[PDB]
Structure formats: C-alpha cells, structure tokens
Amino acid sequence: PNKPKRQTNQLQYLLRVVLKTLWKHQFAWPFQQPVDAVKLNLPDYYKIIKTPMDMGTIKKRLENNYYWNAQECIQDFNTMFTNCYIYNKPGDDIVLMAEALEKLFLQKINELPTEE
Ligand SMILES: COc1cc(C)cc2c(=O)cc[nH]c12
Numbered sequence: 128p129n130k131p132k133r134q135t136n137q138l139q140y141l142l143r144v145v146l147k148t149l150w151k152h153q154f155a156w157p158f159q160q161p162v163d164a165v166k167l168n169l170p171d172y173y174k175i176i177k178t179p180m181d182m183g184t185i186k187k188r189l190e191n192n193y194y195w196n197a198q199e200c201i202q203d204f205n206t207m208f209t210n211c212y213i214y215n216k217p218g219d220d221i222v223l224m225a226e227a228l229e230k231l232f233l234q235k236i237n238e239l240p241t242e243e
Pocket of ligand 1: 158162167172211221
C-alpha cells in the first residue's frame with residue numbers, strides 16, 4: 128500500500144550533514160577526492176579494491192538523486208571505508224581514518240531521519 132519514493136530526506140541528511148561532515152573531516156582527504164592509485168602508488172588498488180569509492184563520487188550520487196534511498200549512499204560510504212579496509216589491512220592509517228569517518232558517518236546515520 129505504498130509506492131517507493133526516492134527517500135530524499137535521509138539522502139538529504141546523508142548529503143547535507145553526513146557528506147559534508149565527513150567531507151570536512153581530518154580523515155576525509157582520500158575520500159573527498161578519489162585516490163589516484165598512481166599517486167599514492169597503489170599498483171593493485173583498482174585490482175584489489177572492489178569499487179574504489181570516494182565522498183566525491185558519493186556526493187555526486189546524492190546530489191544527482193542517483194541514490195534511491197539513503198542506505199545506498201550509506202553503503203557507498205561503507206564501500207568507501209571498506210575499500211580502505213580492502214586494500215589497507217585493518218589498522219592502516221587510512222583504514223583508521225576511514226574507521227574514524229565510519230563512527231562519524233555512522234554517527235549521522237545513527238541520527239538518520241525517517242521520511243514523514
Ligand atoms: C587513499 O587512501 C589511501 C589508500 C591506500 C591504498 C594507501 C594510502 C596511503 O598509503 C596513505 C594515505 N592514504 C591511502
């Protein structure tokens with residue numbers, strides 16, 4: 128008894144607060160922009176990494192209403208941190224960074240709205 132909508136307020140939140148909150152983070156630098164796997168010297172990054180994901184690509188999918196619901200934006204956020212876990216063994220600064228961005232991103236989603 129309900130037609131699916133593009134859940135824009137959670138996605139809004141994920142864009143407005145989360146995205147920007149992450150974006151601005153001490154640890155957001157490799158996520159704001161997409162890693163040049165040549166730049167950080169990552170010969171197997173686009174090899175190992177499932178789908179190298181950045182707050183940029185994510186801010187894209189959010190503000191371009193590509194996301195149908197926040198959880199995809201979240202899973203891209205999770206993806207973002209998980210690629211960092213995928214490549215960099217858990218305990219690497221970038222994972223640790225992602226890990227601090229997780230508790231920050233997930234901070235927001237811990238407070239993620241529900242559509243009226
Ligand atoms: C963009 O996030 C990163 C990914 C990888 C694979 C390595 C590093 C790194 O060696 C230092 C900072 N960030 C990294």
